[PDB]
Amino acid sequence: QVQLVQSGAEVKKPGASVKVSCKASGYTFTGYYMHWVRQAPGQGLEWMGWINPNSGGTNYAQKFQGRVTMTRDTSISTAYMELSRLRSDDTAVYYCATQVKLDSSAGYPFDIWGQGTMVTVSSAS
Amino acid sequence: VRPLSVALGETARISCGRQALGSRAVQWYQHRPGQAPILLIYNNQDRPSGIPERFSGTPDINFGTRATLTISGVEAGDEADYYCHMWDSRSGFSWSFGGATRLTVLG
Amino acid sequence: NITDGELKNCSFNMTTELRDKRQKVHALFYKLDIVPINENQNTSYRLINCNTAAITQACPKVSFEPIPIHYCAPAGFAILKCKDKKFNGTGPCPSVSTVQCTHGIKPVVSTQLLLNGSLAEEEVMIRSEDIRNNAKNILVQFNTPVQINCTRPNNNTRKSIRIGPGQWFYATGDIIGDIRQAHCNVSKATWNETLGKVVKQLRKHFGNNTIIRFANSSGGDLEVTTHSFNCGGEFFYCDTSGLFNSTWISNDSITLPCRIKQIINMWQRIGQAMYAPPIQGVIRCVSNITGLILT
Amino acid sequence: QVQLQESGPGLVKPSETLSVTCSVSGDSMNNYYWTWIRQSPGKGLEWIGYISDRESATYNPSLNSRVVISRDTSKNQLSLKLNSVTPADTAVYYCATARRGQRIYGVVSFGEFFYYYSMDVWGKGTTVTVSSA
Ligand SMILES: *[C@@H]1O[C@H](CO)[C@@H](O[C@@H]2O[C@H](CO)[C@@H](O[C@@H]3O[C@H](CO[C@H]4O[C@H](CO[C@H]5O[C@H](CO)[C@@H](O)[C@H](O)[C@@H]5O[C@H]5O[C@H](CO)[C@@H](O)[C@H](O)[C@@H]5O)[C@@H](O)[C@H](OC5O[C@H](CO)[C@@H](O)[C@H](O)[C@@H]5O)[C@@H]4O)[C@@H](O)[C@H](O)[C@@H]3O)[C@H](O)[C@H]2NC(C)=O)[C@H](O)[C@H]1NC(C)=O
Ligand SMILES: *[C@@H]1O[C@H](CO)[C@@H](O[C@@H]2O[C@H](CO)[C@@H](O[C@H]3O[C@H](CO)[C@@H](O)[C@H](O)[C@@H]3O)[C@H](O)[C@H]2NC(C)=O)[C@H](O)[C@H]1NC(C)=O
Ligand SMILES: *[C@@H]1O[C@H](CO)[C@@H](OC2O[C@H](CO)[C@@H](O)[C@H](O)[C@H]2NC(C)=O)[C@H](O)[C@H]1NC(C)=O
Ligand SMILES: *[C@@H]1O[C@H](CO)[C@@H](O[C@@H]2O[C@H](CO)[C@@H](O)[C@H](O)[C@H]2NC(C)=O)[C@H](O)[C@H]1NC(C)=O
Ligand SMILES: *[C@@H]1O[C@H](CO)[C@@H](O[C@@H]2O[C@H](CO)[C@@H](O)[C@H](O)[C@H]2NC(C)=O)[C@H](O)[C@H]1NC(C)=O
Ligand SMILES: *[C@@H]1O[C@H](CO)[C@@H](O[C@H]2O[C@H](CO)[C@@H](O)[C@H](O)[C@H]2NC(C)=O)[C@H](O)[C@H]1NC(C)=O
Ligand SMILES: *[C@@H]1O[C@H](CO)[C@@H](O)[C@H](O)[C@H]1NC(C)=O
Ligand SMILES: *[C@@H]1O[C@H](CO)[C@@H](O)[C@H](O)[C@H]1NC(C)=O
Ligand SMILES: *[C@@H]1O[C@H](CO)[C@@H](O)[C@H](O)[C@H]1NC(C)=O
Ligand SMILES: *[C@@H]1O[C@H](CO)[C@@H](O)[C@H](O)[C@H]1NC(C)=O
Ligand SMILES: *[C@@H]1O[C@H](CO)[C@@H](O)[C@H](O)[C@H]1NC(C)=O
């Protein structure tokens, strides 16, 4: 079935790098884009960027310019997301979305989503 | 150590033992036993101050040639040991002067 | 022994026509076609592609030079050509003509920069499908071609060795001359004038007073981050960061470095990898850069 | 228009300090480089190393790196210190000057050039013979 699995992450300390995954199945993985979105607890959504797994061409917003890196391993149809030099306001939940099925041909909007992983940070233990 | 006997009136040509690979820059030196060594040619086409214009250098254009110092109109003063100094691109930094040659005149 | 590098000399065992004899041959390989296998920490190298896919050679009796190709419709159909000087991409076209079939087309492969295309008329063209969304590449076509000269000053040598009964294997046996990096030059004043023209034309779609800035590629590959093309029988990869490094508001030519690959994976697929034979002598390619592709 | 005149002990037992100073007479030094040359009877000239204003002291990779060159701007002199000498090291020592030039064949932006030193003005040179007697 068309779906996306993720891997839950533990709380990280400030100044560390997180590792986010997103694994798809079913439909062909090298045909459509894939976006990354974040949701803060008690606020609205905010878009992070979009990666094209066909050729590795990425494009992300200016809010995270120079701090996030997106890769892809099409040999096993999995994505990745790295982020170092963290802060305290980056406590949120992350999602990876696609546009596998829609009558229109434009890239937006995306409909299918995944489980999602809530990442939060703590200064001390 | 390699001698070369050329009588008076003949124009001789002495070359360097070690060949070069690529862009080249050769310097020449002359040394008499007991005297001080003085350069002859540098940059393969330049002439220093205080030398007769009888030693024609070897221009390095359209790489594929070699380096050789010729002597035109040899006199009594042109009889000593010669030294060749090579500087190229595919060898790095040259330290030693390498082998030398010795010229002898007849009559 | 160049003291403190782009290529490396590798020696290895190879078969012969006689099934019991084994010879030892040496060749030169570029740094982008070799991956270490030990890492702890000695030097024992291997190729890049035969961990995942197979490899075939391109015997040099054929050439890759692009030639004009006309697409001609069969008996019963027809082709309609529009001749509007303000064709923004979609909509009606007043001047329509019917031709037997089209003119020559040069199927040249390129990335981030079109080459040997068709010049516009009286203006530069800025086309796209939807401009108000960041999911469609935007095409730009100039009105005057810019000259660009790529060159690899090395002097290679083709060395052929036997690999079996009736087969042959070519390699770059030796480099004779001066080890230097292959580069590419582009005029500076013409480039700045063309960029001024294109930003003046682009200002029509984004308000009459805005700030336009350029930036280099984002990254994540070796084919869609640099400027990739082929000429003289060799594939180049020339960095293009020294071009989109300006900011616009309200005879000293530019140079660009280039790397060279041999084991390419063009026409993205699995199970196939095309080797490229080396070209003998020197290569010098002049081109008319005309296009632009911008996200 | 500079002349260099060297002075040394000449006879010294092995494994002691051998210092031969080459005093300078002429114009002041601001850009020229200096070099020492050793010549043994039966062997050619030995380019041991050069000195510059950047306190750079490099030598041949086969000279065991046991000799040091120094320059004092107070006395305006140049000296050398070579310890642990061997009686088989008798030779004449010249203190000369040299100039650095560059040769370009490719593109300067990528560093397709290389340097080379040429000794234009020379000195006199004296012979030092070391032994246990
Ligand atoms: C893409 O674009 C790039 C961008 O330019 C191109 O890159 C250049 O590429 C060319 C060739 O590929 C390359 O030229 C190479 O240059 C060397 C060196 O040239 C220098 O020196 C010689 C000789 O000189 C000395 O002596 C004269 C006379 O006494 C002095 O006036 C001079 O100052 C020099 O003194 C220097 O040495 C002294 C010690 O001897 C020292 O004391 C001094 O302090 C100095 O250091 C010059 O002749 C030469 O210049 C010339 O240019 C004139 C005008 O055009 C012409 O009349 C003659 O050519 C003249 O020689 C230069 O000054 C040459 O020897 C090589 O032959 C070669 O030309 C150049 O350096 C690269 N870089 C630049 C910035 O240009 C690239 O080629 C291009 N590629 C493609 C594919 O398009
Ligand atoms: C864009 O079009 C260019 C045509 O102007 C083309 O340049 C030509 O490319 C060839 C390929 O090697 C060069 O060499 C050809 O011509 C020489 C002439 O002696 C032949 O000996 C060679 O065998 C070969 O046929 C040309 O010199 C070069 N220029 C011209 C004027 O023909 C570019 O290659 C094209 N761009 C790309 C990316 O392909
Ligand atoms: C590459 O290197 C080749 C080998 O030296 C060289 O070839 C020859 O050209 C020189 C120069 O005229 C001749 O003297 C020689 O006889 C030639 N030999 C052969 C076998 O052809 C090439 O000229 C070099 N490449 C370039 C572009 O100069
Ligand atoms: C790569 O290594 C090979 C073998 O070590 C080199 O081939 C020889 O090169 C040396 C130069 O150091 C010559 O003395 C030999 O005569 C050559 N042949 C053999 C059979 O050893 C090769 O030159 C090296 N590559 C480069 C670019 O230097
Ligand atoms: C690319 O190569 C062409 C061909 O050499 C260059 O064109 C010429 O320019 C030089 C000097 O600028 C003139 O001596 C030639 O007569 C010109 N020939 C032609 C046919 O126009 C061109 O300048 C090179 N590009 C760059 C940026 O230097
Ligand atoms: C695009 O241009 C930027 C401009 O600097 C390049 O920037 C940086 O990254 C380098 C290595 O990753 C660092 O060494 C620089 O210090 C750093 N500079 C800045 C201002 O951040 C970037 O590498 C270029 N990208 C590509 C793909 O070439
Ligand atoms: C095959 O048999 C022959 C018999 O002489 C022997 O010499 C040879 O070594 C054998 N095969 C190989 C390649 O060893
Ligand atoms: C061939 O392999 C043997 C051992 O596998 C090795 O000793 C030898 O060096 C190889 N040949 C060459 C030319 O390196
Ligand atoms: C082209 O013009 C038509 C006419 O209004 C318009 O609908 C369309 O959006 C335009 N497209 C572009 C890419 O300018
Ligand atoms: C881009 O332009 C700036 C302007 O000063 C310059 O410092 C920088 O070196 C340029 N980048 C490249 C890659 O040339
Ligand atoms: C490149 O432009 C020049 C100038 O218009 C033209 O003469 C040349 O034919 C063009 N190149 C090609 C391959 O058409």
Author numbering:
A (entry chain H): 1 to 52, 52A, 53 to 82, 82A, 82B, 82C, 83 to 100, 100A, ...
B (entry chain Q): 8 to 66, 66A, 66B, 66C, 67 to 95, 95A, 95B, 95C, ...
C (entry chain B): 137 to 140, 152 to 186, 186A, 187 to 309, 312 to 321, 321A, 322 to 397, 411 to 455
D (entry chain N): 1 to 82, 82A, 82B, 82C, 83 to 100, 100A, 100B, 100C, ...
Article passage:
BG24, a VRC01-class broadly neutralizing antibody (bNAb) against HIV-1 Env with relatively few somatic hypermutations (SHMs), represents a promising target for vaccine strategies to elicit CD4-binding site (CD4bs) bNAbs. The VRC01-class of bNAbs targets a particularly challenging epitope to elicit bNAbs against due to the presence of the CD4bs N-glycans that sterically obstruct interactions between Env and Ab CDRs26. The glycan at position N276gp120 is highly conserved and poses the greatest steric barrier to binding VRC01-class bNAb iGLs, as Ab residues in the iGL CDRL1 that interact with this region are typically 11–12 residues and cannot accommodate the N276gp120 glycan. Mature CD4bs Abs develop shortened or flexible CDRL1s to accommodate this glycan.
We solve two single-particle cryo-electron microscopy (cryo-EM) structures of GT1 in complex with BG24iGLs containing either mature or iGL CDR3s at 4.1 and 3.4 Å resolution, respectively, in both cases in the absence of chemical crosslinking. Cryo-EM structures of BG24iGL-CDR3iGL and BG24iGL-CDR3mat Fabs bound to GT1 were solved at 3.4 and 4.1 Å, respectively. Both 3D cryo-EM reconstructions showed three BG24iGL and three 10-1074 Fabs bound per Env trimer. The GT1 complexes with BG24iGLs included density for CD4bs N-glycans attached to residues N234gp120, N363gp120, and N392 gp120. The CDRL1 interface with GT1 in the BG24iGL-CDR3iGL and BG24iGL-CDR3mat structures showed the longer CDRL1s in the germline precursor VL domains in different conformations, demonstrating CDRL1 flexibility consistent with cryo-EM data processing. Indeed, the local resolutions for the CDRL1 in these structures were poor and resolved only after iterative rounds of focused classification and local refinements. Residue S100AHC is a germline-encoded residue, however, in both BG24iGL-GT1 structures, is not within the distance to form a hydrogen bond with K97gp120. In BG24iGL-CDR3mat-GT1, atoms within these Fab residues were separated by more than 5 Å from atoms within gp120 residues; thus, this is not defined as an interaction.
